[PDB]
Design an enzyme around this catalytic site. Structure first.
Site, mmCIF file in Angstrom:
data_model
loop_
_atom_site.group_PDB
_atom_site.id
_atom_site.type_symbol
_atom_site.label_atom_id
_atom_site.label_comp_id
_atom_site.label_asym_id
_atom_site.label_seq_id
_atom_site.Cartn_x
_atom_site.Cartn_y
_atom_site.Cartn_z
ATOM 1 N N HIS A 1 -3.388 -6.653 6.184
ATOM 2 C CA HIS A 1 -3.585 -5.441 6.951
ATOM 3 C C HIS A 1 -4.973 -5.436 7.574
ATOM 4 C CE1 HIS A 1 -0.337 -3.210 4.380
ATOM 5 N NE2 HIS A 1 0.198 -3.860 5.400
ATOM 6 N N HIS B 1 -1.983 -7.327 0.447
ATOM 7 C CA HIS B 1 -1.161 -6.965 -0.701
ATOM 8 C C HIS B 1 -0.328 -8.201 -1.021
ATOM 9 C CE1 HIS B 1 -1.978 -2.652 0.110
ATOM 10 N NE2 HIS B 1 -2.053 -3.110 1.349
ATOM 11 N N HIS C 1 -8.191 -2.402 -6.392
ATOM 12 C CA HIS C 1 -6.835 -2.231 -5.853
ATOM 13 C C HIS C 1 -6.426 -3.412 -4.976
ATOM 14 C CE1 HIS C 1 -8.415 2.010 -6.288
ATOM 15 N NE2 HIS C 1 -7.377 1.998 -7.107
ATOM 16 N N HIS D 1 -7.521 -6.356 4.468
ATOM 17 C CA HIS D 1 -7.205 -6.652 3.077
ATOM 18 C C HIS D 1 -5.763 -7.128 3.015
ATOM 19 C CE1 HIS D 1 -5.863 -2.516 3.844
ATOM 20 N NE2 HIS D 1 -4.859 -2.834 3.049
ATOM 21 N N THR E 1 -0.848 3.181 2.767
ATOM 22 C CA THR E 1 0.102 2.828 1.707
ATOM 23 C C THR E 1 -0.462 2.985 0.296
ATOM 24 O OG1 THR E 1 -0.458 0.473 1.749
ATOM 25 C CG2 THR E 1 1.340 1.216 3.236
ATOM 26 N N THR E 2 -1.709 3.438 0.205
ATOM 27 C CA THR E 2 -2.307 3.804 -1.078
ATOM 28 C C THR E 2 -2.767 5.252 -0.985
ATOM 29 O OG1 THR E 2 -4.553 3.144 -0.422
ATOM 30 C CG2 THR E 2 -3.172 1.454 -1.434
ATOM 31 N N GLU F 1 4.502 -5.223 1.689
ATOM 32 C CA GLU F 1 4.755 -3.793 1.647
ATOM 33 C C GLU F 1 5.917 -3.466 2.564
ATOM 34 O OE1 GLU F 1 0.806 -1.745 1.929
ATOM 35 O OE2 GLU F 1 1.369 -1.552 -0.188
HETATM 36 C C1 LIG Z 1 -7.635 1.664 5.115
HETATM 37 C C2 LIG Z 1 -7.489 1.804 3.635
HETATM 38 O O1 LIG Z 1 -7.266 2.953 3.153
HETATM 39 O O2 LIG Z 1 -7.392 0.757 2.920
HETATM 40 C C3 LIG Z 1 -7.117 0.872 1.541
HETATM 41 C C4 LIG Z 1 -8.021 0.063 0.696
HETATM 42 O O3 LIG Z 1 -9.381 0.074 1.035
HETATM 43 C C5 LIG Z 1 -7.490 -1.271 0.515
HETATM 44 O O4 LIG Z 1 -8.315 -2.085 -0.263
HETATM 45 C C6 LIG Z 1 -6.112 -1.333 0.040
HETATM 46 O O5 LIG Z 1 -6.023 -0.913 -1.299
HETATM 47 O O6 LIG Z 1 -5.215 -0.666 0.901
HETATM 48 C C7 LIG Z 1 -5.640 0.681 1.192
HETATM 49 C C8 LIG Z 1 -4.591 1.418 2.021
HETATM 50 O O7 LIG Z 1 -4.617 1.078 3.357
HETATM 51 S S1 LIG Z 1 -3.504 0.387 4.041
HETATM 52 N N1 LIG Z 1 -2.481 -0.338 3.093
HETATM 53 O O8 LIG Z 1 -2.921 1.658 4.467
HETATM 54 O O9 LIG Z 1 -3.611 -0.132 5.410
HETATM 55 ZN ZN LIG Z 2 -2.891 -2.298 3.080
#
Ligand SMILES: CC(=O)O[C@@H]1[C@H](O)[C@@H](O)[C@@H](O)O[C@@H]1COS(N)(=O)=O
Ligand SMILES: [Zn+2]
Length: 257
Positions: free
Chosen positions: A116, A93, A61, A91, A195-196, A103
């Site tokens: 993030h 986006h 992802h 990570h 956000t995922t 995002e």
């Molecule tokens: C903390 C976490 O859930 O991170 C996850 C994943 O590990 C990360 O690789 C990415 O896909 O964003 C996600 C969503 O997180 S984010 N975008 O809310 O800060």
């Molecule tokens: Zn994120």
């Protein structure tokens, strides 16, 4: 399962994850002329001096640079936050083109990417417990625009060749997250969600006003990553961003006038 393609992308998530249409979803558009300066916000405190990076992982992802969070080595405090939030991973986006990938948006403007830095509230003992709390996580978001190269990002860029496909990981020690921060810590803040999927509504979002610049060559290397696992048909890891969700009954506060 879930992804960012036409058939499993953000438009579909609500079917498996009904909270997708919930009360405090992220990301949102940041209307700079509606956000309220909050003189009661304390200074933001990023304490990353003892940060211990361990590993970089392609999870299908995005890619996560993971940190040792067994102790208070790298923490976020102050601003809108009560107590201590420990860095667990960061990570990005990003888009298929420089004109998209972030995002959050700022007055509807999309950036080429968004970093993030994810932290969890230590009062809840572990990350898994923290995500079940309305104040369990604090995520520091930083916009990337394409311009001159970011030297502090190059070590990340360099190792991407070794984690091209889903499931791959590489040793990633002694990386300093401080190299990814802009000069100013002016920010907007609002209560939101991951956000995922599972889209849990456990996040205090802190989004910095000032973008960092990365080079075209640097973002190009992000786009060479794969959503797929090794040996599978190639799907380039691009446009792994959720679009802005309705603000609903929330207010965005600003740390600055
Ligand atoms: C903390 C976490 O859930 O991170 C996850 C994943 O590990 C990360 O690789 C990415 O896909 O964003 C996600 C969503 O997180 S984010 N975008 O809310 O800060
Ligand atoms: Zn994120």
């Amino acid at each position: 399962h879930w992804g960012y393609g036409k058939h499993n992308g953000p438009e579909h998530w609500h079917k498996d994850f009904p909270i997708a249409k919930g009360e405090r979803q992220s990301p949102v558009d940041i209307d700079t002329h509606t956000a309220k300066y909050d003189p009661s916000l304390k200074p933001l405190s990023v304490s990353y001096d003892q940060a211990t990076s361990l590993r970089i992982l392609n999870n299908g992802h995005a890619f996560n640079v993971e940190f040792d969070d067994s102790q208070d080595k790298a923490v976020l405090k102050g601003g809108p936050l009560d107590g201590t939030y420990r860095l667990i991973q960061f990570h990005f986006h990003w888009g298929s083109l420089d004109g998209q990938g972030s995002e959050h948006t700022v007055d509807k403007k999309k950036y080429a990417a968004e970093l993030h830095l994810v932290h969890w509230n230590t009062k809840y003992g572990d990350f898994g417990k923290a995500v079940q709390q309305p104040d369990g996580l604090a995520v520091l978001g930083i916009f990337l625009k394409v311009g001159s190269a970011k030297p502090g990002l190059q070590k990340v860029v360099d190792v991407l060749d070794s984690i091209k496909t889903k499931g791959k990981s590489a040793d990633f020690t002694n990386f300093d997250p401080r190299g990814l921060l802009p000069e100013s810590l002016d920010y907007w803040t609002y209560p939101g969600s991951l956000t995922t999927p599972p889209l849990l509504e456990c996040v205090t979002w802190i989004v910095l006003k000032e973008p960092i610049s990365v080079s075209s060559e640097q973002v190009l290397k992000f786009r060479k990553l794969n959503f797929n696992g090794e040996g599978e048909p190639e799907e380039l890891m691009v446009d792994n961003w959720r679009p802005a969700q309705p603000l609903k009954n929330r207010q965005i506060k600003a740390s600055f006038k």
